């Protein structure tokens with residue numbers, strides 16, 4: 001066996017996949033995940049994949065700090081060769097997904113712009129929670145229009161000029177973050 | 192035990208106090224009414240083999256009470272591969288002359304099946320280690336049974352997190368590290384042979400034996416325990432064996 | 446794209462890009478500003494990565510830039526909901542749900558066993574003591 005390397009966390013709206021190298025040659029992998037004081041949970045048993053979906057483990061508590069390790073096992077079946085992953089705190093590191101402008105309505109002399117609820121992989125009491133459900137006040141949405149507006153909800157109420165048709169685009173933002181603070185811009189929508 | 196707590200009376204029911212000539216020798220773990228698992232190195236300096244006593248139900252060494260049961264050690268079985276003065280294959284299986292009586296204060300720890308131990312118990316983060324050993328590296332030993340919760344490490348991590356020391360023993364497949372590298376908690380010399388017990392789904396199992404370490408609660412070091420899972424077959428086979436005239440028996444391993 | 450008689454009208458995002466597929470320059474001619482045209486184009490020409498219906502077993506796809514997210518039904522997981530949680534009952538997966546011992550049986554279901562002093566319960570996974578003082582239990586507490 002050869003130990004996995006370049007273990008990387010790919011996470012968006014809590015969909016969290018651990019990826020690694022290299023492609024297996026006469027060896028299979030098994031992944032383990034845990035929190036600093038918790039027990040190790042096994043996932044992706046004897047897989048030939050070089051990735052492992054850990055979404056279901058991390059969504060149990062998105063604010064926890066998880067560490068994973070990829071075990072290498074020789075083909076056919078004593079501590080195995082393994083590599084530890086970087087630590088990963090979902091709440092602080094999951095990328096914000098690309099938003100979608102749900103609608104825009106000219107209410108009076110202003111335009112209301114509504115951002116579609118971004119659904120995440122966290123599924124409270126049967127349903128998938130939105131980004132706002134998860135982040136609350138930590139999440140704001142920003143609007144680039146033609147110039148910039150910001151909201152604590154999923155709606156913007158901006159002043160427009162009579163009959164001028166504006167164009168808009170929005171981003172999900174977690175202001176408290178130092179890194180990975182925003183999503184990619186939503187597709188542009190014009191009146 | 193450095194940095195632990197007193198194990199409340201009756202809460203470490205499988206802990207054994209081994210005495211030689213009436214004096215404190217080592218800890219041990221009751222696994223059934225007749226057998227006790229301890230560490231091989233505990234018998235490195237023994238000359239009076241007929242003077243070994245196993246005490247069950249012990250708690251406070253300064254007081255005797257009606258819960259204590261003493262039995263003569265009839266046999267001490269060590270792997271013939273073990274070398275006195277060294278660390279590898281640090282395990283001993285002792286046959287008591289007469290069985291202890293199981294009570295609320297004397298209960299055996301479950302010796303687990305090997306695979307269950309390797310694939311399941313080995314991944315339970317915390318386990319308890321206990322004994323009447325030193326309360327501080329080179330300090331006085333404890334009068335009341337002490338217990339400590341320690342996290343287990345895979346050997347690769349142990350090596351990577353342990354301070355480089357010239358002459359240090361190899362951490363083999365017959366051992367595992369558990370503890371803290373921060374100088375705050377750890378088992379110690381006098382705890383040798385005591386249990387490293389793992390709680391899983393409501394039942395406690397024997398996963399390790401207090402074996403060695405660089406000092407006790409030394410910065411950059413973890414406690415090293417005998418990996419009991421490597422000896423399951425060896426222990427079971429031997430427990431079905433018939434007594435021999437001499438006390439000490441060096442049995443082939445595997 | 447062009448077809449002469451339809452090209453007599455002034456520029457229109459709806460006509461040229463929303464109803465028809467436009468080129469970067471057509472779009473640029475509409476937005477004029479580079480940045481404007483850039484953010485529009487970035488998503489417009491990105492493509493719907495969910496078009497290929499990558500999410501299996503009843504999962505739902507949500508498009509992103511050059512990628513997608515699969516939301517799975519409860520009994521599935523994996524990037525594409527390809528993993529059946531129901532086909533994972535093996536001993537390495539949380540002891541196969543067994544309280545004490547677990548035995549794998551390829552082709553058939555795994556079974557659970559107990560340590561001496563315990564017998565397997567009705568449920569086929571839990572263990573109950575058959576003696577007053579089974580190993581591994583602390584009586585003064587329980």
Ligand SMILES: *[C@@H]1O[C@H](CO)[C@@H](O)[C@H](O)[C@H]1O
Pocket residue numbers: 493494495496497498499500
């Ligand atoms: C279409 O679906 C396949 C898998 O079903 C995926 O690999 C592609 O990325 C997606 O666009």
Ligand SMILES: *[C@@H]1O[C@@H](C)[C@@H](O)[C@@H](O)[C@@H]1O
Pocket residue numbers: 503504505506516517518
């Ligand atoms: C996409 O999401 C999954 C979870 C189910 O609700 C599907 O019916 C839906 O289309």
Ligand SMILES: NC(=[NH2+])c1ccc(N)cc1
Pocket residue numbers: 377378379380381382383401402403404405406407408413414415
């Ligand atoms: N855990 C330890 N530091 C240790 C255990 C046994 C021993 N004899 C010496 C040190």
Ligand SMILES: [Ca+2]
Pocket residue numbers: 249250251252253254255256259
């Ligand atoms: Ca006493």
Ligand SMILES: [Ca+2]
Pocket residue numbers: 447448451452465
């Ligand atoms: Ca046309």
Ligand SMILES: [Ca+2]
Pocket residue numbers: 446447448451460461465
């Ligand atoms: Ca056209």
Ligand SMILES: [Ca+2]
Pocket residue numbers: 456471474
């Ligand atoms: Ca044009």
Ligand SMILES: [Ca+2]
Pocket residue numbers: 470471474
């Ligand atoms: Ca043109």
Ligand SMILES: [Ca+2]
Pocket residue numbers: 491492493494508509510511512
């Ligand atoms: Ca896309």
Ligand SMILES: [Cl-]
Pocket residue numbers: 116117118119130131132133154
């Ligand atoms: Cl949202």
Ligand SMILES: [Cl-]
Pocket residue numbers: 261262263287288289
């Ligand atoms: Cl006796």
Ligand SMILES: [Cl-]
Pocket residue numbers: 379380404405406407
């Ligand atoms: Cl020491």
Ligand SMILES: [Mg+2]
Pocket residue numbers: 459460463464
């Ligand atoms: Mg149109």
Ligand SMILES: [Mg+2]
Pocket residue numbers: 446461467471
């Ligand atoms: Mg055109």
Ligand SMILES: [Mg+2]
Pocket residue numbers: 470471473474
């Ligand atoms: Mg042009």
Ligand code: NA
Pocket residue numbers: 371372373374375376377407408409410411412413
């Ligand atoms: Na230490």
